Enzyme design. Structure first.
Site, short mmCIF file in Angstrom:
data_model
loop_
_atom_site.label_atom_id
_atom_site.label_comp_id
_atom_site.label_asym_id
_atom_site.label_seq_id
_atom_site.Cartn_x
_atom_site.Cartn_y
_atom_site.Cartn_z
N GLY B 30 0.82 -1.22 0.00
CA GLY B 30 0.00 0.00 0.00
C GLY B 30 0.85 1.26 0.00
O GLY B 30 0.29 2.35 -0.29
N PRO B 38 2.80 -2.48 -8.59
CA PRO B 38 1.61 -3.25 -8.27
C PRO B 38 1.79 -4.12 -7.04
O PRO B 38 2.90 -4.54 -6.75
CB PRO B 38 1.39 -4.08 -9.55
CG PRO B 38 2.74 -4.17 -10.24
CD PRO B 38 3.64 -3.10 -9.62
N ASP B 39 0.70 -4.36 -6.30
CA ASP B 39 0.67 -5.39 -5.24
C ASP B 39 0.79 -6.79 -5.88
O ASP B 39 -0.23 -7.39 -6.22
CB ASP B 39 -0.60 -5.24 -4.42
CG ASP B 39 -0.69 -6.13 -3.20
OD1 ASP B 39 0.12 -7.03 -3.04
OD2 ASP B 39 -1.65 -5.93 -2.45
N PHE B 40 1.99 -7.35 -5.89
CA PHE B 40 2.28 -8.68 -6.52
C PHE B 40 1.48 -9.83 -5.88
O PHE B 40 1.27 -10.84 -6.58
CB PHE B 40 3.79 -8.93 -6.46
CG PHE B 40 4.59 -7.84 -7.13
CD1 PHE B 40 4.40 -7.57 -8.47
CD2 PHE B 40 5.49 -7.06 -6.42
CE1 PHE B 40 5.10 -6.56 -9.10
CE2 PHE B 40 6.19 -6.05 -7.05
CZ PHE B 40 5.97 -5.78 -8.39
N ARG B 41 1.03 -9.70 -4.63
CA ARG B 41 0.39 -10.79 -3.86
C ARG B 41 -1.12 -10.86 -4.08
O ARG B 41 -1.73 -11.89 -3.70
CB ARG B 41 0.61 -10.61 -2.35
CG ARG B 41 1.95 -11.17 -1.93
CD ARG B 41 2.38 -10.68 -0.57
NE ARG B 41 3.76 -10.20 -0.58
CZ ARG B 41 4.16 -8.93 -0.43
NH1 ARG B 41 3.31 -7.92 -0.33
NH2 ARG B 41 5.46 -8.68 -0.48
N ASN B 108 8.10 -5.21 0.88
CA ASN B 108 8.26 -4.80 -0.54
C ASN B 108 9.66 -5.13 -1.04
O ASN B 108 10.64 -5.02 -0.28
CB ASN B 108 7.99 -3.29 -0.67
CG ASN B 108 6.60 -2.91 -0.19
OD1 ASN B 108 5.69 -3.74 -0.14
ND2 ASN B 108 6.38 -1.62 -0.02
N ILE B 109 9.75 -5.39 -2.35
CA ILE B 109 11.01 -5.77 -3.05
C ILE B 109 11.50 -4.65 -3.99
O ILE B 109 12.57 -4.85 -4.65
CB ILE B 109 10.85 -7.13 -3.75
CG1 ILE B 109 9.73 -7.12 -4.78
CG2 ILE B 109 10.66 -8.20 -2.69
CD1 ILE B 109 9.92 -6.14 -5.93
N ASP B 110 10.84 -3.49 -4.02
CA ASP B 110 10.97 -2.46 -5.06
C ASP B 110 12.12 -1.47 -4.80
O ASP B 110 12.32 -0.63 -5.68
CB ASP B 110 9.65 -1.72 -5.24
CG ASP B 110 9.14 -1.09 -3.93
OD1 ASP B 110 10.00 -0.58 -3.08
OD2 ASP B 110 7.88 -1.20 -3.70
N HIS B 127 11.00 -9.76 2.74
CA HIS B 127 10.84 -10.60 1.52
C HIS B 127 11.99 -10.35 0.55
O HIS B 127 11.80 -10.71 -0.60
CB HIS B 127 9.50 -10.31 0.91
CG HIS B 127 8.38 -10.64 1.83
ND1 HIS B 127 7.16 -10.01 1.73
CD2 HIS B 127 8.29 -11.52 2.85
CE1 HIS B 127 6.33 -10.55 2.61
NE2 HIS B 127 7.02 -11.42 3.37
N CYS B 161 25.72 -15.83 -14.58
CA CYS B 161 26.95 -15.39 -13.88
C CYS B 161 28.12 -15.28 -14.86
O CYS B 161 28.46 -16.26 -15.57
CB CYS B 161 27.29 -16.38 -12.78
SG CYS B 161 28.77 -15.93 -11.95
C1 LIG Z 1 7.22 -12.08 -1.65
O1 LIG Z 1 6.19 -11.35 -1.45
C2 LIG Z 1 8.06 -11.63 -2.84
C3 LIG Z 1 7.22 -11.42 -4.09
C4 LIG Z 1 8.06 -10.85 -5.21
C5 LIG Z 1 7.41 -10.80 -6.55
C6 LIG Z 1 8.06 -9.81 -7.46
C7 LIG Z 1 7.49 -9.83 -8.84
C8 LIG Z 1 8.46 -9.38 -9.88
C9 LIG Z 1 8.86 -7.93 -9.73
C10 LIG Z 1 8.80 -7.20 -11.03
C11 LIG Z 1 9.58 -5.94 -11.12
C12 LIG Z 1 9.81 -5.25 -9.83
C13 LIG Z 1 11.25 -5.18 -9.47
C14 LIG Z 1 11.69 -3.79 -9.14
ZN LIG Z 2 28.70 -17.71 -10.41
#
Ligand SMILES: *C(=O)CCCCCCCCCCCCC
Ligand SMILES: [Zn+2]
Lengths: 6, 287
Positions: B30, B38-41, B108-110, B127, B161
């Protein structure tokens, strides 16, 4: 650990 | 009670008292939806083109381990055109500058918390993150920055790699993976020390992140800033905002940015927040 889940 | 009233006004008065020194923020999708992330979940947030057994497999470790290509093609689809943190991210930078931030626990992963000026020491990325990626070979584990990873996702080249030609994975926690040790180590220490829990932009539906609200001391006030009320006991299977026994939990319902503006205004921080955001947004626009 207690794994990531909804 | 530490709060004199169960309102945002009560929380702001507590924050400016000698009793409030250490703030933990718990944040979810949020806080990044006004940045266009976007909310990926959320099932309600274009997959048939892959041979997935079930839509949810695109974020499960078990599937990613079998076939990583769907994840990476989707990553290209979803990759943001810009990384511009929200008013809510810069509010957390203010907390840091005012010496109030003990920790920010993010779902969040962003990377927007890092862009907004929170340091690795200030963050628990529950996460993980796209900020760094690693070779998956246990013997190698070469680290790669997001600029490198972005280049490979766009190319439509599965990222390999440079040293050992193994897959390189963004440092995210897939569904079905253990959270980082750092999550558990920080939780044990920080919740002994917390004076205020600020819960922003999360419906608290992901475990074990959602268990953090039960780790607060009994006295610690908990402010939820979210579009919807969340975190109450499940009358089938918590926060107590509305009962005659409510004493420390407050809900502010609305967009996270508007709640953080409203709280900043009570604190006398509105001009500092406005000036911080406009400067950082201009900087990012001019990249
Ligand atoms: C646990 O909730 C992790 C969920 C992660 C899913 C991420 C989806 C892919 C992301 C796309 C681009 C965003 C990266 C900056
Ligand atoms: Zn490697």
């Amino acid at each position: 650990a207690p794994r990531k889940q909804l | 009670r530490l709060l004199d009233e169960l309102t945002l006004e009560g929380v702001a008065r507590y924050m400016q008292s000698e009793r409030c020194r250490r703030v933990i923020c718990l944040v979810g999708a949020g806080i990044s939806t006004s940045a266009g992330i976007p909310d990926f979940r959320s099932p309600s947030t274009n997959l048939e083109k892959y041979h997935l057994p079930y839509p949810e497999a695109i974020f499960e470790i078990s599937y990613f381990k079998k076939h990583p290509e769907p994840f990476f093609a989707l990553a290209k689809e979803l990759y943001p055109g810009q990384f511009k943190p929200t008013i809510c991210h810069y509010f957390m930078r203010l907390l840091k500058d005012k010496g109030l931030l003990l920790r920010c626990y993010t779902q969040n992963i962003d990377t927007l918390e890092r862009i907004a000026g929170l340091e690795q020491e200030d963050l628990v990325e529950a996460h993980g993150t796209f900020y760094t990626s690693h070779c998956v070979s246990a013997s190698c584990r070469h680290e790669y920055p997001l600029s490198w990873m972005k280049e490979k996702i766009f190319s439509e080249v599965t990222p390999k790699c440079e040293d050992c030609q193994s897959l390189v994975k963004p440092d995210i926690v897939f569904f079905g993976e253990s959270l980082p040790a750092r999550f558990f180590s920080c939780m044990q220490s920080d919740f002994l020390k917390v004076d205020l829990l600020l819960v922003m932009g999360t419906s608290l539906q992901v475990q074990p992140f959602a268990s953090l609200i039960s780790k607060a001391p009994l006295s610690t006030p908990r402010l939820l800033i979210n579009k919807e009320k969340a975190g109450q006991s499940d009358p089938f299977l918590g926060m107590d905002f509305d009962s005659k026994k409510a004493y420390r939990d407050v809900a502010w319902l609305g967009e996270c940015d508007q709640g953080c503006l409203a709280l900043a205004e009570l604190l006398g921080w509105k001009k500092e927040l406005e000036d911080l955001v406009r400067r950082e947004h201009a900087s990012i626009d001019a990249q």
